[PDB]
Amino acid sequence: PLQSVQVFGRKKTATAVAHCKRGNGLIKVNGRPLEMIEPRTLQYKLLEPVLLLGKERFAGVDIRVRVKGGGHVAQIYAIRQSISKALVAYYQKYVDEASKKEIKDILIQYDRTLLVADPRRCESKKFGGPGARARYQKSYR
Amino acid sequence: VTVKDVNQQEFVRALAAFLKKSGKLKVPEWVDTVKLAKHKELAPYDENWFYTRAASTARHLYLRGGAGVGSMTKIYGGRQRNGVMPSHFSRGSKSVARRVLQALEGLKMVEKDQDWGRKLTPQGQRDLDRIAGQVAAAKKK
Amino acid sequence: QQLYWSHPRKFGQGSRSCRVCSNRHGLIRKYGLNMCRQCFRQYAKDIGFIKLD
Amino acid sequence: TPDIKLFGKWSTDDVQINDISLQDYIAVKEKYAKYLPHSAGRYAAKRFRKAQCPIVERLTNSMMMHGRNNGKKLMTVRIVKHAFEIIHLLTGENPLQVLVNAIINSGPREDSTRIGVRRQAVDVSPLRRVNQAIWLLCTGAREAAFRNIKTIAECLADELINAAKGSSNSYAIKKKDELERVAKSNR
Amino acid sequence: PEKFQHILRVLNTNIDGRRKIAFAITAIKGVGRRYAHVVLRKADIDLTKRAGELTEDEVERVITIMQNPRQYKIPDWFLNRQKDVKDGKYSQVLANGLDNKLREDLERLKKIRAHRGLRHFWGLRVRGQHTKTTGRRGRTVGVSK
Amino acid sequence: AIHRIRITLTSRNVKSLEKVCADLIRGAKEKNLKVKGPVRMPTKTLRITTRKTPCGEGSKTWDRFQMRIHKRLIDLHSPSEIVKQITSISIEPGVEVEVTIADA
RNA sequence: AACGAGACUCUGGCAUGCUAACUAGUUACGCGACCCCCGAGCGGUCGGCGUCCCCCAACUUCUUAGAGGGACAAGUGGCGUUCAGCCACCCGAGAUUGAGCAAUAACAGGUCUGUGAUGCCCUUAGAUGUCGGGGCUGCACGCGCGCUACACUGACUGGCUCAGCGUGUGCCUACCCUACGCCGGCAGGCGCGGGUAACCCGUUGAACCCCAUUCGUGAUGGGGAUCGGGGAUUGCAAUUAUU
Numbered sequence A: 001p002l003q004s005v006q007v008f009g010r011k012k013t014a015t016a017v018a019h020c021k022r023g024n025g026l027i028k029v030n031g032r033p034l035e036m037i038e039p040r041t042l043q044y045k046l047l048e049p050v051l052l053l054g055k056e057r058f059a060g061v062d063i064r065v066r067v068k069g070g071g072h073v074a075q076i077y078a079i080r081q082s083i084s085k086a087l088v089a090y091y092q093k094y095v096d097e098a099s100k101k102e103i104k105d106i107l108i109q110y111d112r113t114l115l116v117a118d119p120r121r122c123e124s125k126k127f128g129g130p131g132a133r134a135r136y137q138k139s140y141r
Numbered sequence B: 001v002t003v004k005d006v007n008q009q010e011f012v013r014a015l016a017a018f019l020k021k022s023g024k025l026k027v028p029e030w031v032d033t034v035k036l037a038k039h040k041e042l043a044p045y046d047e048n049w050f051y052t053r054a055a056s057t058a059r060h061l062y063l064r065g066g067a068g069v070g071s072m073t074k075i076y077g078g079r080q081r082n083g084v085m086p087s088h089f090s091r092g093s094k095s096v097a098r099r100v101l102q103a104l105e106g107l108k109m110v111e112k113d114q115d116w117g118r119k120l121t122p123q124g125q126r127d128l129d130r131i132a133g134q135v136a137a138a139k140k141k
Numbered sequence C: 001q002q003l004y005w006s007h008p009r010k011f012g013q014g015s016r017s018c019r020v021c022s023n024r025h026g027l028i029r030k031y032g033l034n035m036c037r038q039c040f041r042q043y044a045k046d047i048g049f050i051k052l053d
Numbered sequence D: 001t002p003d004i005k006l007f008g009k010w011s012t013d014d015v016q017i018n019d020i021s022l023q024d025y026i027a028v029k030e031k032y033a034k035y036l037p038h039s040a041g042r043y044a045a046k047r048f049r050k051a052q053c054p055i056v057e058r059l060t061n062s063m064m065m066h067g068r069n070n071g072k073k074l075m076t077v078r079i080v081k082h083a084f085e086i087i088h089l090l091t092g093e094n095p096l097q098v099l100v101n102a103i104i105n106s107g108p109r110e111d112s113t114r115i116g117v118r119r120q121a122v123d124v125s126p127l128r129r130v131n132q133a134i135w136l137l138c139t140g141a142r143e144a145a146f147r148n149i150k151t152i153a154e155c156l157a158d159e160l161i162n163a164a165k166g167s168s169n170s171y172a173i174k175k176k177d178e179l180e181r182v183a184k185s186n187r
Numbered sequence E: 001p002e003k004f005q006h007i008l009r010v011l012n013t014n015i016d017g018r019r020k021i022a023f024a025i026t027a028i029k030g031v032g033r034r035y036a037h038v039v040l041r042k043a044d045i046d047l048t049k050r051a052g053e054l055t056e057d058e059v060e061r062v063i064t065i066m067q068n069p070r071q072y073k074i075p076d077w078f079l080n081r082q083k084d085v086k087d088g089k090y091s092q093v094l095a096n097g098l099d100n101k102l103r104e105d106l107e108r109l110k111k112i113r114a115h116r117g118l119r120h121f122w123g124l125r126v127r128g129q130h131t132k133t134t135g136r137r138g139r140t141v142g143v144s145k
Numbered sequence F: 001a002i003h004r005i006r007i008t009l010t011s012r013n014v015k016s017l018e019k020v021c022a023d024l025i026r027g028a029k030e031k032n033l034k035v036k037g038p039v040r041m042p043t044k045t046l047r048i049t050t051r052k053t054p055c056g057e058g059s060k061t062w063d064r065f066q067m068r069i070h071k072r073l074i075d076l077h078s079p080s081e082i083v084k085q086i087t088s089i090s091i092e093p094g095v096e097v098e099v100t101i102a103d104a
Numbered sequence G: 001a002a003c004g005a006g007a008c009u010c011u012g013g014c015a016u017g018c019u020a021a022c023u024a025g026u027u028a029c030g031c032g033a034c035c036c037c038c039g040a041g042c043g044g045u046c047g048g049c050g051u052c053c054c055c056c057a058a059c060u061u062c063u064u065a066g067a068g069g070g071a072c073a074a075g076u077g078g079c080g081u082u083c084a085g086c087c088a089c090c091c092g093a094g095a096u097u098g099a100g101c102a103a104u105a106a107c108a109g110g111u112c113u114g115u116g117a118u119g120c121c122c123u124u125a126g127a128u129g130u131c132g133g134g135g136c137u138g139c140a141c142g143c144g145c146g147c148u149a150c151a152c153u154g155a156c157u158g159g160c161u162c163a164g165c166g167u168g169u170g171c172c173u174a175c176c177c178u179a180c181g182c183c184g185g186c187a188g189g190c191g192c193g194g195g196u197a198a199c200c201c202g203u204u205g206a207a208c209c210c211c212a213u214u215c216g217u218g219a220u221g222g223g224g225a226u227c228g229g230g231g232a233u234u235g236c237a238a239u240u241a242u243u
């Protein structure tokens, strides 16, 4: 009668899938405490959902996370989007509905793209210039 | 606590200070007159650089048990500045990576696994996790 | 008559030439076409390459 | 406490803005309190959307400039962090209020356009005020620390300080009042 | 702290006493920085004291290493002059041995008038560089007559 | 006797490949042969990019030619004769089919 | 009425709905094994770490790729002769993704040095149809596309941790990408396997970035031109220095 759920988050081709289940605390990512994901200048970014929702909601679930793709910063947003997109689907499935409407509005009013992925991806270079829109120098005379 | 529980730099410093506290782990003769890779421009400052390098090598074997010398030289590769031409990615030194893995087999921490490559012995993993707990208890982690 | 009628032509531009026009100078080796850069635009369709990028 | 947010340490809710013209165009209180000056933030997609952007993030974005800094943003956040930490020592006051002061007292409230060298005087919109003040006091710092032993955090800090109390010892103020005198002449 | 003499005159050149000893002795020709670190390492000297903080006996320990490297176990692939063309020795020419060894090498080349000797004579580029748009020292010329 | 046997299909036009695959699936399931469904290997794309101009004159336009290759697999557990029979039937268009001895 | 515009074709963005996968996986436990107490406990049990080994377990969220779905200025409020349409806002993955294709009439535009496409003229055995050597690289000077820099928002030395598009044994032709062991400071050498490729290189341990050490406003350890000496690989051959 297992009670678990799985949801992902993307940001610029950097996917992070979080799996949340019945438990007590214990939010990990690739096997490390989230205190220790490398670019620690950004730590408050990936503490945002728990620091915003309070550790009373993060009390009955254990949420592991597997990340792969993208760059260093583009994975901080993958993680930061995946775990909060999870605590809102473990509630919506195994709790009442009207309790998850609290989570979703504490969340979406502070910062969107904790539930809605950025649709931005790199544009493709063209002949004539070094990148997508620039062009090489033009020497008239 | 395991190794993934603790900050991966002070763990390295502890492991180096421990490796250079046994008298074992013979170092090569040329330890003080070597550039350490094709792309560097100077010899390492830390007179004990072989101990640190062996420590990090063992840790890296712990996290990915099938390395072999051809990736220790990739794990250690860097960026070469070709004078007046653009830089390019360049590998480590094969010879020191080889002599590091050989020096670890003398401590019975490493052994040549099935297929080909290297992994830590059961007795190596204990030697690691012990100082992992030592670190977690010193810094209170 | 002659024993000097060739000297090694086993690499570089002397080795290879287009399978159509017999020219050198700007042939496509990719995928084993071995075809002059102008001659390929000519049959780029019968091979199956279609421009849609 | 959990209804209230900090840049790790500094409080927002004790701030004040005294220029009623700029109250729409500096974001610091309330729904604009964020933990870090780093958000993805598709701000530059419409016209006035740039006004919603938290003022400390705008101060960061305008700092990575002159070529060999384009893109390097984590360095910019670690610069701003240090600058505020120095400001709290040199004054003993809240760093955010000093920033708000140094922005307010650097926007040239009158500029001269070009018609034909013949100029004319015109007044600047409230958004251009802050857009110019930011540029000026980030150029002052980058300029004061180009071949000196001082560090960019030190110079940015003393720039914000010497500007928050218009002192003629800061690049921003000098350039602002000098851009206003040229307008004053060809009024 | 440590207010005794700093500047020292190691052979024929004035080694400034202020800089770190590694970057201090590099003011000798023929002695770059990669060679200097090896010399200091084989000399056991600390590498956190300036040139002013060394007494008169360590400096001889360093000199004799710079002069006789082969014997203090500095391998034969560090020395700047190898299988020396006239006599087969291996060594570091140091201060004016460098000037004279360049002088002798250019004389050796010009003597049999090799294609490099003539290029050194005419004052041109000796390796294979194009010369149509480079070097470019002289003065502008005009089309007028 | 009963053997594992894998048929691999390759082409460049997708509709012929898909219709061939579905018909083989039909003919296999009419005999109840326990067919493992079609696995779609990643499509391959060959790119060739050349100057447009015969000589060297003009502004510097380029062509971008590309050809696509589709590849899928189906797996059967059965004797050889029925599969080599039904394979031998029902292929009219230009599509490549290769069937091997065993793949499990 | 016809062409061009538009429509169109490819691509990017959304599906926890469908189809279905030892050449992709995940979760579970059947597992078992290693390790630490790291927490209840004691060390097992409760748990924690696993690109450790399995399953003839369950499934398709992540991966792959097919069929359909979705967006229409459709809804709401203003401005519009109440038309054609514009502006803001709501719900939303999205209210303007990026390319390919392109008309009539022309130009003394470029190309005879892409062509066994080609008219006329020329040369045709003392050749303008082959081998050895040299040149296209020659340097008083004028210009064009660029690369690396003038440093502290930095250089050096360690440490830590992240991708995506791709190509790969050659049909004459004769060569491919490389794992793992060993030898050498380094370039490199020997040995012995995989790959005709979602199967092997490969979980592609990429750089900037990130963290910690030395230097200190000095053409300095910034910068790395020019030049001396030595050691390898490619090849029939390296001098005017291939790398």
Ligand SMILES: [Mg+2]
Pocket: A130, A131
């Ligand atoms: Mg670019």
Ligand SMILES: [Mg+2]
Pocket: none
């Ligand atoms: Mg650069």
Ligand SMILES: [Mg+2]
Pocket: F042
């Ligand atoms: Mg692919």
Ligand SMILES: [Mg+2]
Pocket: none
């Ligand atoms: Mg479209």
Ligand SMILES: [Mg+2]
Pocket: none
């Ligand atoms: Mg896609």
Ligand SMILES: [Mg+2]
Pocket: G051
């Ligand atoms: Mg795995």
Ligand SMILES: [Mg+2]
Pocket: none
């Ligand atoms: Mg479709």
Ligand SMILES: [Mg+2]
Pocket: none
């Ligand atoms: Mg209406």
Ligand SMILES: [Mg+2]
Pocket: G092
């Ligand atoms: Mg919305």
Ligand SMILES: [Mg+2]
Pocket: none
């Ligand atoms: Mg369009």
Ligand SMILES: [Mg+2]
Pocket: G103
């Ligand atoms: Mg037209």
Ligand SMILES: [Mg+2]
Pocket: G111, G112
């Ligand atoms: Mg022609």
Ligand SMILES: [Mg+2]
Pocket: G112
């Ligand atoms: Mg003709």
Ligand SMILES: [Mg+2]
Pocket: G130
């Ligand atoms: Mg001929």
Ligand SMILES: [Mg+2]
Pocket: none
């Ligand atoms: Mg010839």
Ligand SMILES: [Mg+2]
Pocket: G136
């Ligand atoms: Mg030329």
